Amino acid sequence: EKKRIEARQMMDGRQALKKKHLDLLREFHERQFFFWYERASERLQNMNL
Amino acid sequence: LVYAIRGVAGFGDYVMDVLSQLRPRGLTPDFVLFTLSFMYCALQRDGELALAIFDQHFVHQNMNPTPEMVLLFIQACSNCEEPTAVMLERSETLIKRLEAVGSSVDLISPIYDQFLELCAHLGAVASGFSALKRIVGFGKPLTTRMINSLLLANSNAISSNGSLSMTEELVGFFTLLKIRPNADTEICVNLCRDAFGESPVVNDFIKVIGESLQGDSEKGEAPQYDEDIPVIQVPPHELRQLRTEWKLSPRDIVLRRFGQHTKPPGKAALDVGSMRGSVIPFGRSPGEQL
Amino acid sequence: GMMAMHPPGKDGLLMPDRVVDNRLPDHLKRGYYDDVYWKDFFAGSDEHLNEPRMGLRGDEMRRRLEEAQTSPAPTTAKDTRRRTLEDVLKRLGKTTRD
Amino acid sequence: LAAEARREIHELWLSAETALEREKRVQQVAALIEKYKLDPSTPREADVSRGLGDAFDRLLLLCLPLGKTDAKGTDNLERLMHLAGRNGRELSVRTIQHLFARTDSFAEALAVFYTMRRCHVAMNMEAYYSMLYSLQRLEEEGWGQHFRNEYEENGAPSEQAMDFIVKGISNALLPENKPWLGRVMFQDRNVPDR
Amino acid sequence: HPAIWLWYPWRMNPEPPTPHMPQRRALKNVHGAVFNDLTPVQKKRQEQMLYGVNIPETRQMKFEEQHPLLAGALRKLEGQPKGFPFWYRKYPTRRHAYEYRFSIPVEMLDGYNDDVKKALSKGMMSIQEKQFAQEAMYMERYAEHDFDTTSPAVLAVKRALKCRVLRNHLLTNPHNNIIKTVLANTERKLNHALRRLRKVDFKKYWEIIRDHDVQDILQPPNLVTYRQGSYWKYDWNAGLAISTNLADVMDPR
Amino acid sequence: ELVAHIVRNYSQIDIIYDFLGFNYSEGYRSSLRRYMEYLQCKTAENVRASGRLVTGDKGEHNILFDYCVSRESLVSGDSCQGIIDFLYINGNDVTLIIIASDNPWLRNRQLPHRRQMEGIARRVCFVLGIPPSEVRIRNLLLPPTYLDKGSIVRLNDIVFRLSNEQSNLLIPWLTNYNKELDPKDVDYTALAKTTNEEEWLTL
Amino acid sequence: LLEIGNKLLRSPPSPEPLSGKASKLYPPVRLRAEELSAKYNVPMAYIDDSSEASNASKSLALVMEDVGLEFTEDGLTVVISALSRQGYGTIGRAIFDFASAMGLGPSAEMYRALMKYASRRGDVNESMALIEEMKGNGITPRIGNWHELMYTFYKAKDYPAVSQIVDNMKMYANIEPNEVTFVLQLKALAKDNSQLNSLPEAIQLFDQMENVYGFIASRPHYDAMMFHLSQSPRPEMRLR
Amino acid sequence: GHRLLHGKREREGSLFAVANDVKRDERLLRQQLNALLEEEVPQTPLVDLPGVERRRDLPADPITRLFFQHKGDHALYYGTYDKPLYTPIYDFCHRIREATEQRKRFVVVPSTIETRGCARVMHDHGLVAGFRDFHNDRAFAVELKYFQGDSTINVIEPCSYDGRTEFEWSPKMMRRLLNTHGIHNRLVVYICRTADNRIIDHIHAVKENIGGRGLMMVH
């Protein structure tokens, strides 16, 4: 029983770490969108010509 | 059935019984049906029915809410009579879940406007002020209706928190943000004045807003007012169905119409080796040198 | 390593050959061994040798608690209070006018 | 005229560093703007803004702390932000942090945020996150001032005040309970709001 | 006014950058593991799902490195209206913007003509854009978070859409043997995804079945094997035997 | 007769019973709160209590706050660092008393971060008006299912600023309380050592 | 060096600006110093603020320059090693702590210099405590530190521990052994008596070093191998 | 409200960052994310030694404990070697044989429980020089042992000669392996995993009177 409860707790800790790394990935992907916006905004200006 | 009684009162128990009876019939409620139910709740401005529906049917579904559904729920919970703090908690939970999940439509401004109106009715000045950070993060501009809701929250939050400093901080928006005042703004600021006291800045703002309202009345014929947010009453067949089409056929898939191919294994399964003797560990000749 | 294989000592790791109880056969642990290790039991400070360690160790606490219990409490329950409706209103921050 | 404006902006910055009235500094920055014609309608010729350089950001940050309620004291900042947007200059992280350090009230922070939104000013994600952190710190300071006033007028801390002490602000975009946000955005430059 | 009395430049030789080089290289490794180190199909899917994964830190793609003229042109009008995007919070991935071509948010088309709006409207979207719009609608319906593309329901709907596309292709091109084999593989994968979704989350599986009218999509092929209980032994062999939460749906007494 | 004598003489027998770890139903947090408020009232002599907040009558700050129960506050599978059980403000010092959990993977979440401690100290400065120059804050991790003599002594020394002699004068049963930490749980012992051997965080 | 270490131990200096002239222990011969160090990435030992610590650092630098060592990390490592070889472990540790507090980074070489004192005396517990302290200070134990640990166990007459440390260094530490490592292992196997296969192990290890690693045996290798082989009366080993 | 976590990937909380792909490798991404979460205010970094998440997981050997550090969650995703139809033991034996027939110094083999146990047993018996990246949970390097040209390992054969049949060894089988061909056999080593997830050889198996599932033989 002790081993089983330890395994369950380890799974929960893994889920917590997954949430943390998902937050990190969200922050990373927001930054990469900024590159896309700057590149895309300049191109659309040309299309107005 | 739910859409037919949208303009009829005294049918919340019927809606709840229909939702309960959905399960024995082999059917499950979906986002369209929840949207229709919350549309009925917002139209009837009952609030308690919407709260009960969310508490005992929706949370078990564990589905992503839609912006229309969230807006209808918040509209019902705000326009209802005698709102409670559990309604604020549910609205915050729904807003957080909606932000966490994705969306294509944009109802952020009306959703937050109704949330601020709910905070005004409840007295949650802190929640109303904190929703401003969410609005700023979304980049949406503030509205005179939102500021009026903040003023009303300050007026009717005598117990929890709020004072002349809060009144001044709220009233410094119209000058700084260049937002036109309103008759509802004047009423709310007078209510806040009577609730807390007489600050000179508040008095000067009251005088200038009275002069501006008189000038606007002279220019036009009727004083301006904060128009209420319209309630969606569209039929269920044009409620932005989140499914295009699946014209698949299980009979054709099982009968292998169009000639599907699976590339079966060859000699690997068939071969079993020599069965002259018994299968012993390490084989008959463990190890070999060539 | 032998230090890792054998159990540690008092201040940390210790070689098994540094313990007399290990390197000395049991049949030779009588006589001179007892003379050598007598001081490990029967030598020390006067308090260490004469103070009885098998006596009562909670008598001070017990007597403190007994005298505290015998000592009365000047303040008791507010049975002399009016306990009226006006008192309840004052407790709730209310009154007849409210 | 660009060098003259640069040294004039330096002298105005040192004057503002010296103890001066907020209305006085508003008048000084407005007079400088009108005398150098830092107007959006100015053509490419005689555009001191394009050559201001560091003077441009110095004048941008010189007016914010003295916002008060003056219409001129707001529209001078609006004109400066419009000029920045027309010239395409992007505000650095240091510039944003210095601009929001001089901010005193949440109303003024909202005013400057919406003014720069109207003027379409360029910046990076690190600057945006620094602005958000400053905004939430300003809201926290306002709530702390309110609770200090209520505590000093009531004689004892309230349960709500202690709950606020433990929790923080109601809502946040970089909440303290998860001290791993902003690592990607910030290049190990934590904003020390004071 | 402190002054330094001792210093050894050659003994020091210090090169710690104030922008932390370990942080720079960690970000580069993350970007490489997300986009650069992938198969071509995975790179295509990553580009289709995310906004600027192909743009490096230098903001110059390899194609731009090799063909500067074909990548960019000269335009007199400055990007004065284009400042910081204050609406970026609501568009984390491409699936949040499937209304216009190239997944362009609506707010970005403000100071642009109705002709450009019509050119970027839905009618001009390509076949790939329309397929991504469909799968993005389904991901919006059945997503767990903003960057959720591997939910069981999302996998089921994507497998079904792939099967539909392959079958529609075979409707007009009935002599594509490789497409026939791919369709068989996709149907098997869809069956596995649907069985897993049915066992782990029955609500969404039932909703999908009812919505798309494929009631018998999960049926046993052969009576000979079915009557030996090999169709139900799949649930046990797949680790999905005991997962129902009996208390929620029934009375375990 | 013996139980009557015990209840008549040992007024805090239930507190000792819960601290030793005998209470399996509701832990020992309630007894810890009763012990802390008893010490606070014995020190202040003008203690006023209102629900889960106990405050002295101005002067030197003596504030005890029962924030929440960490056992129910902590949720497995989520990411939220820093959940305190008790908050004690004594003078210009703030102490975050946190009871550890039986799950070793949740202690890291339970302990608040340095930024969280700085923010809480800043909030204390904002609300109570304590100058930022002289403000200290620190954590205090307590064993999950009991409360050993060493932990109690550290609590008395750090939180209530009471030396051992006057603590024993105030509390008779303290000197005979001889409960020690469980030798099996080494994760908690190491965490408690590295948490209680750190200096006060200033400002 | 001994008198400087005694002064630094008995009466450690103070990080105050105007304490150098006030203190007779370390007689001399606005902008914050720590802020300047943080801005310009310079150690606090190179800053002259007329402080007591500044005077102590200047005296130490003058003494080391007189000896022939620059006031840097390598010079500090050399002086601490020289002290530790001739006892004076406490004085060496005091100098190490003073350098750490003055900003000259306590590198793994300095930690090895500290470990030399325990290695010469054979204090296994002290060497392990030093390894743990180096790990806790965020510094990876290097091949020299592992060599000093092996020498500590060899001098403490636990010879199989040297081989165990070598195996753990190869497996977990991931440090390729060098000629010094091979010499230490050969000495440990030569003096080892826990297992009967020490001589075959040493011979195979020597062959492995010669062939696989590609090293060339030097005088230490040859002396260790000959000392091991001159212990068995077998004519084959004598011929070897 | 309950979401079932089906599969070891979901139980271990894989991010599934790659779009529409669940079987993609993620260890590098997780390692870089942990490196980002590391702190460069006294901020002591973490050493490169292999670590464990729990203080109780430190080895009981005091010397071995010096090579392990207690890292909370950064201890996961350790290792540099990546994963290099058949059983892991069969693959391990094939790699070892085909590299010792090519006179290589190191062989990268997948690090499973049985594989690392067999590697440790061979190291104890002296058939392997050493190991690299042994704490890695995916693969590790076996350093081959050479003496006077020819390799120490002569014949290495897995128990599952066809790669699809497993065998359970009784204590009688272990004792017969010990006394194979009428002689006491400490020369050829038979390795078996016991019922307690413990990998030993036939000598220890017959000493403690147990058996197990055989893995491979090497001499």
Automatic annotation (TrEMBL), chain B:
<protein>
    <recommendedName>
        <fullName>Pentacotripeptide-repeat region of PRORP domain-containing protein</fullName>
    </recommendedName>
</protein>
Automatic annotation (TrEMBL), chain C:
<protein>
    <recommendedName>
        <fullName>Small ribosomal subunit protein uS5 C-terminal domain-containing protein</fullName>
    </recommendedName>
</protein>
Automatic annotation (TrEMBL), chain E:
<dbReference type="GO" id="GO:0020023">
    <property type="term" value="C:kinetoplast"/>
</dbReference>
<protein>
    <submittedName>
        <fullName>Uncharacterized protein</fullName>
    </submittedName>
</protein>
<dbReference type="GO" id="GO:0005739">
    <property type="term" value="C:mitochondrion"/>
</dbReference>
<dbReference type="GO" id="GO:0005763">
    <property type="term" value="C:mitochondrial small ribosomal subunit"/>
</dbReference>
UniProtKB/TrEMBL annotation, chain G:
<protein>
    <recommendedName>
        <fullName>PROP1-like PPR domain-containing protein</fullName>
    </recommendedName>
</protein>
<feature type="domain" description="PROP1-like PPR">
    <location>
        <begin position="92"/>
        <end position="190"/>
    </location>
</feature>
<feature type="repeat" description="PPR">
    <location>
        <begin position="107"/>
        <end position="141"/>
    </location>
</feature>
